[PDB]
Amino acid sequence: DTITLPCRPAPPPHCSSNITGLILTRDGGVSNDETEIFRPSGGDMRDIARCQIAGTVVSTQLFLNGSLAEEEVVIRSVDFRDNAKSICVQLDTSVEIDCTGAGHCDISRAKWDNTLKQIASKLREQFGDRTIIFKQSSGGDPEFVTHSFNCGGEFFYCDSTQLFDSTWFD
Ligand SMILES: *[C@@H]1O[C@H](CO)[C@@H](O)[C@H](O)[C@H]1NC(C)=O
Ligand SMILES: *[C@@H]1O[C@H](CO)[C@@H](O)[C@H](O)[C@H]1NC(C)=O
């Protein structure tokens, strides 16, 4: 099985990338459900220091191409206790996005799931034994809410509401 994310306009095949990390923002679990909600960020991915892992392509939410870890998912922040501070996520293996040109870029469901199992068990190291909920960016504009990227001089905007709709370790 495969996660089919629609994008506008129809991304060319050469815009296939590797996901090598992502910026998350805890809202975070503010007055108790024994949970933590995390959402992908809509902010500039260079407006977050101590996450100097981006290569060349301009994006939001995830890092297309760019730097990987030595061989364990590494999650960092300037202060996890402050929810205004974004969380840097750097992978160890990259999940490939295959843009076929029709209108959607595709992700192996199995690859994502286990990239999510590792992130959540890393977040669970920092914050402890609590439910890690992955959810959609909660707005701002039609830009913010999507995974946007630059490829061939143009911006493509992908409905990323599928990658972030999970709960781990209830
Ligand atoms: C993505 O994944 C691996 C990372 O080592 C790389 O060897 C491969 O060439 C990359 N392919 C694409 C399409 O990004
Ligand atoms: C990322 O790297 C691959 C392999 O070099 C490249 O072909 C692809 O176009 C890059 N992705 C983007 C969005 O430019």
Are 105 and 99 contacting, i.e. CB atoms less than 8 angstroms apart?
Answer: yes
CA-to-CA separations, 68 to 40, 92, 125, 136, in angstroms, rounded: 19, 5, 20, 24
Q: Solving technique for this entry?
A: X-ray
**Cβ 17 under 6 angstroms from ligand 1:** yes
**Cβ 151 under 6 angstroms from ligand 2:** yes
* Cis peptide leading into residue 9 (ω within 30°): yes
Tokens of 118: 């590792």
Q: What is the dihedral of CA 40, 43, 49, 53, to 10 degrees?
A: 60
Are 41 and 118 contacting, i.e. CB atoms less than 8 angstroms apart?
Answer: no
Calculate how far, in angstroms, residue 18's C-alpha sits from the geometric centre of ligand 1. 6
The Cα–Cα gap between 123 and 120 comes to 5
The Cα–Cα gap between 168 and 66 comes to 27
**Cβ 16 under 6 angstroms from ligand 1:** yes
Are 102 and 86 contacting, i.e. CB atoms less than 8 angstroms apart?
Answer: no
Mutate to test the pocket of ligand 1, among 56, 96, 111 (most ligand atoms within 8 A of CB): 96
* Cis peptide leading into residue 101 (ω within 30°): no
DSSP string of 79-120, one letter each residue: -TT-TTS-EEEEEEEEEEEEE-SSSEEEEEHHHHHHHHHHHH
Cα–Cα–Cα angle for 19, 23, 29, nearest 5°?
Answer: 130
DSSP string of 146-160, one letter each residue: SEEEESSS-EEEE--
The Cα–Cα gap between 13 and 145 comes to 23
Calculate how far, in angstroms, residue 13's C-alpha sits from the geometric centre of ligand 2. 10
Closest ligand 1 atom to Cα of 16: 13
**Cβ 61 under 6 angstroms from ligand 1:** no
